[PDB]
């Protein structure tokens, strides 16, 4: 009902296929999820020195925040995703929707907090049960990267 939505994208693990339009992936996510909502956040975490520069430019043209971390710390991206989920939850109240685009079961408890103590609607976009259990909705990441337009 005009409730806020935040998208948090683990793009290291749910990546855009080589040669394909990241713009189209972002468009598909927004088309699937954003009707009736106000966008509070749409962010991905990555080490931009590892990522395809054209993909990153597409993301910035699509107004997806590209939060840079140094991936030589193996838990840096996961930590930043957790912190961003929590920051979203810190100043919004139910009703609100979190879309986590990740397959990292490491987020289980985060989602539990968001579901139980914050009362948020949780959509997990994953590649595939402990992680799935706390989500309200489970969507396969594949539908957002299948048969994409090519560069």
Numbering used by the authors: 349 to 476, 480 to 502
Question: Which sentences did the original study use to describe this structure?
Answer:
Meiosis arrest female 1 (MARF1) is a cytoplasmic RNA binding protein that is essential for meiotic progression of mouse oocytes, in part by limiting retrotransposon expression. Human MARF1 contains a NYN-like domain, two RRMs and eight LOTUS domains. Thus, MARF1 post-transcriptionally represses gene expression by serving as both an endoribonuclease and as a platform that recruits the DCP1:DCP2 decapping complex to targeted mRNAs.
To gain structural insights into the MARF1 NYN domain, we crystallized a human MARF1 protein construct encompassing amino acid residues 352–500 and determined its structure at a resolution of 1.7 Å by single-wavelength anomalous diffraction. Although the NYN domain crystallized as a dimer in the asymmetric unit of the crystal, both the wild-type NYN domain and the mutated protein used for crystallization (I391M/L457M) are monomeric in solution, as determined by size exclusion chromatography. The MARF1 NYN domain consists of a central six-stranded parallel beta-sheet flanked by pairs of alpha-helices on both sides, in contrast to the previously determined structure of the NYN domain of Bacillus subtilis YacP/Rae1, whose central beta-sheet contains only five strand. Despite lack of extensive sequence conservation, the MARF1 NYN domain exhibits substantial structural similarity to canonical PIN domains of ribonucleases MCPIP1 (39) and SMG6 (40), superimposing with root-mean-square deviations of 3.0 Å (over 96 Cα atoms) and 3.4 Å (94 Cα atoms), respectively. A prominent feature of the molecular surface of the MARF1 NYN domain is a highly conserved negatively charged patch formed by Asp358, Asp426, Asp427 and Asp452. Similar clusters of acidic amino acids define the active sites of PIN domain ribonucleases, including SMG6 and MCPIP1, in which they coordinate a divalent metal ion that in turn coordinates the substrate RNA and activates a water molecule for nucleophilic attack on the scissile phosphodiester group. Importantly, these amino acids are strictly conserved in MARF1 orthologs and map to equivalent residues in the SMG6 and MCPIP1 domain structures. Crucially these residues are not present in the SMG5 PIN domain, which has been shown to lack RNase activity. Together, these structural observations strongly suggest that the MARF1 NYN domain is a catalytically competent ribonuclease. In order to determine whether residues in the active site pocket are important for NYN enzymatic activity, we generated a NYN mutant in which Asp426 and 427 were mutated in tandem to alanines (NYNMUT). The nuclease activity of NYNMUT was strongly reduced as compared to NYNWT.
